[PDB]
Write a protein that binds this ligand. Structure first.
Ligand SMILES: Nc1ncnc2c1ncn2[C@@H]1O[C@H](COP(=O)(O)OC(=O)Cc2ccccc2)[C@@H](O)[C@H]1O
Ligand SMILES: Nc1ncnc2c1ncn2[C@@H]1O[C@H](COP(=O)(O)OC(=O)Cc2ccccc2)[C@@H](O)[C@H]1O
Ligand SMILES: O=C(O)Cc1ccccc1
Ligand SMILES: [Mg+2]
Ligand SMILES: [Mg+2]
Ligand SMILES: [Mg+2]
Ligand SMILES: [Mg+2]
Lengths: 423, 426
């Protein structure tokens, strides 16, 4: 229940903290990571050139290629014997590491994120994020444990068994991807139960893009508060930022630990708060793998603090990676998702399939009926036309709507694979 | 190196005293706070107060898996739900559910750390954890222990074997923590892609979760150029790290009896046996809060042996357990008995599975095996192998076995516990 002092501090208290910590972090990286010594020298800046927070623009960016070029351990700023934990993003994987203090800090931040989501003394947390080299499972695990809660460490897959245990154990909180949540909801219904009636009070969903419409759908279907938790393995894992449940106004960034920037992704210039651009993070307390101006490839804007003094990120729907170019039109999967979720006759499952027929791109949107609407041809043909129209007019691409049998699309077990490009 | 805890080689006299005080506490905690032990002790006519010495333990009733099953999901917990930090559960009736306070979790991490040190771990070691992460106790058990020991934890878990071998190459782990059956598949994949297993960074393997012969041990040790040690546990008592082998002696898991007090009973009468005599191994938790367990019958068969590298006693490597013991034409046989004969054949792989059928009055035991890749095309070598193997099984175990040589990779590979026996009779 109880907040940390730092969570209610003046913008000036925070600002002083960030400066002290950024000074430390830049110096630590320059002194102890051979990659940052080189990158800084080769960019012509010294850690001493930071006198204020604005000075951060002087320092070079880090990107995934920096890690890939120093695989496996080349970027670590402590000796291998102080590395307590390795994690790896399967997409050679990109490898990250943590001292025992880093693991402690990560636990504290995920515990903070779980409090922010409205957790209470006595709550059980059903963890469905993948356990392994992925950051999700073990991040949520240690965070729920640190928060003093009852942890049920299920991980991914075995969906019928997960539903069995949600009934039997009665967890209050589930920590799982939005796309897997929808499959879990399905299976509940299949087992002839009312998901609304489950014990779950709270979902903490993340690891992939999910629209606010997707949130409201899940909240309706499940009878829960559904909050948005963000981060990426290079920066720490889950718990870089997380939504306050009392405001649900985008994830609040824990910028006592992670200093955010928004840049023009073409030029590299820093933009004032409010402006759309690429999200960039600098770690302020990380030991094993300090990261300096890491380019997330996520597009969003910074916004003033509400439920906290710290700022929020606008929800992420667009990341550069999985943008599609179709007949010379730019489209994110979430743009398609928003149109799909307008059709109450269709499932919230889909895959986009990209093919070439002649010179012209074809976008095919694979979808399903709801089980109860499957036989209702009128309902489905309305959905199919409307969806087709909405994509044309709101997105500007012509989509072939392909209505499969129920269970025809392959269900996510973690991060959903929205797009199969075979062009 | 890594340092002993003082308790590990402190006098037996000191050990006995602290086991007594802890056992008096454990019995009282269970009786006062667990609805199940309140009922059990009352219905046996015993009170915690009745324990004056360690020998009085035989006065108290047994616990079995049935007791946990009947109290699913939480009926056996001895603290309020809000003090349960962790739930674990079986994957294979309904699952049996166990629980832990934060202190239980701490002690578990310390015990697995102790086991990892006993395996010869060094400052700077990386630990590759291939035990399954989730409701199973293995992965998160090993994980927390290796973390607590101050080592570099690589939390892979099970499956993705080709990627696991990639990262043993890339990361150069020093210790691997995995089931012996899966280890074998990992080594196969090393050879396949196409490296010299003996040339790995791996120095130590800490293998458990399932029965495996000392023959298997020497096989893996020779193949991988490692030390292989035996780590034991069961989720009802704690998880991995109830007992673990010292690398300097490799003489059976040393039981951590400062935390888990072992007995050996005659499984038929429940009579307590003297140390050295074979029987069923029974545990009583000494410091557990959430799920105190009193005289838990493990169904594992073994004997207690005097401590060597530690003050604490050892179990003999587990000779057998009731769960996958076969009765074949009147003869009781454990899968490991078959494993021991299989491992004599160098032309055959170390993978196997037993399938039982009926033909008229006869139990038919078919032992599915594979050739080595190298010897696969050597039909004469395979024939000599089938023949010697079938003979060894008849002459040494007294059973008639059909040896069924499958193609390479024809037996489905374990990523955790191998399913040794497929019983298709009725
Ligand atoms: N809440 C979110 N909204 C949108 N995208 C997200 C969100 N959270 C993660 N992503 C995307 O996935 C990346 C990183 O994937 P990566 O595997 O490195 O890290 C883990 O997904 C860490 C995580 C696990 C569980 C919950 C939250 C976060 C990030 O840069 C975003 O593009
Ligand atoms: N070293 C071993 N030798 C023989 N059998 C073992 C060994 N270790 C576990 N077993 C068997 O498997 C059970 C329990 O399975 P359960 O799932 O409850 O717990 C985990 O197997 C705990 C474990 C995980 C990882 C390593 C070691 C131990 C026990 O009663 C034995 O019959
Ligand atoms: O490998 C990844 O980065 C993606 C992932 C998501 C969920 C579970 C495991 C892996
Ligand atoms: Mg409800
Ligand atoms: Mg719909
Ligand atoms: Mg070697
Ligand atoms: Mg052989």
């Amino acid at each position: 229940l109880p907040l940390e002092p730092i969570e209610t501090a003046s913008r000036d208290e925070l600002t002083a903290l960030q400066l002290e910590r950024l000074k430390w972090s830049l110096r630590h990286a320059y002194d102890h990571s051979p990659v940052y010594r080189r990158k800084f020298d080769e960019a012509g800046v010294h850690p001493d050139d930071l006198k204020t927070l604005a000075d951060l623009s002087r320092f070079p960016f880090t990107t995934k290629g920096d890690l890939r070029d120093s695989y496996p351990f080349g970027m670590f700023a402590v000796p291998q014997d102080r590395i307590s934990r390795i994690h790896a993003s399967s997409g050679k994987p990109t490898v990250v590491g943590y001292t025992a203090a880093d693991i402690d800090t990560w636990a504290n931040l995920v515990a903070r994120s779980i409090r922010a989501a409205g957790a209470r003394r006595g709550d059980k947390v059903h963890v469905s994020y993948g356990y392994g080299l992925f950051t999700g499972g073990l991040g949520a695990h240690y965070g729920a444990e640190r928060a003093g809660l009852t942890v049920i460490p299920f991980g991914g897959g075995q969906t019928e068994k997960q539903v069995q245990l949600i009934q039997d154990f009665r967890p209050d909180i589930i920590m799982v991807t939005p796309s897997y949540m929808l499959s879990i909801a399905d299976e509940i219904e299949r087992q002839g139960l009312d998901p609304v009636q489950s014990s779950l009070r709270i979902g903490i969903f993340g690891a992939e893009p999910w629209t606010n419409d997707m949130r409201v759908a899940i909240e309706q279907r499940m009878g829960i508060d559904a909050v948005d938790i963000y981060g990426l393995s290079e920066v720490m894992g889950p718990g870089v930022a997380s939504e306050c449940v009392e405001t649900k106004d985008g994830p609040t960034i824990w910028e006592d630990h992670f200093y955010p920037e928004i840049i023009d992704p073409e030029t590299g210039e820093v933009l004032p708060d409010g402006e759309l651009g690429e999200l960039v993070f600098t770690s302020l307390t990380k030991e094993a793998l300090p990261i300096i101006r890491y380019r997330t490839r996520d597009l969003t804007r910074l916004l003033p603090g509400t439920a906290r003094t710290m700022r929020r990120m606008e929800k992420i729907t667009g990341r550069s990676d999985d943008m599609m170019i179709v007949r010379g039109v730019n489209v994110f999967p979430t743009q398609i998702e928003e149109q799909l979720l307008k059709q109450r006759a269709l499932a919230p499952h889909y895959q986009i399939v990209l093919t070439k027929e002649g010179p012209l791109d074809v976008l095919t949107l694979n979808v399903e009926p709801c089980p109860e609407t499957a036989p209702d041809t009128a309902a489905i043909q309305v959905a199919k036309q409307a969806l087709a129209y909405d994509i044309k007019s709101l997105i500007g691409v012509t989509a072939v709507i392909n209505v499969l049998p129920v269970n025809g699309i392959e269900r996510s077990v973690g991060k959903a694979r929205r797009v199969v490009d075979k062009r």
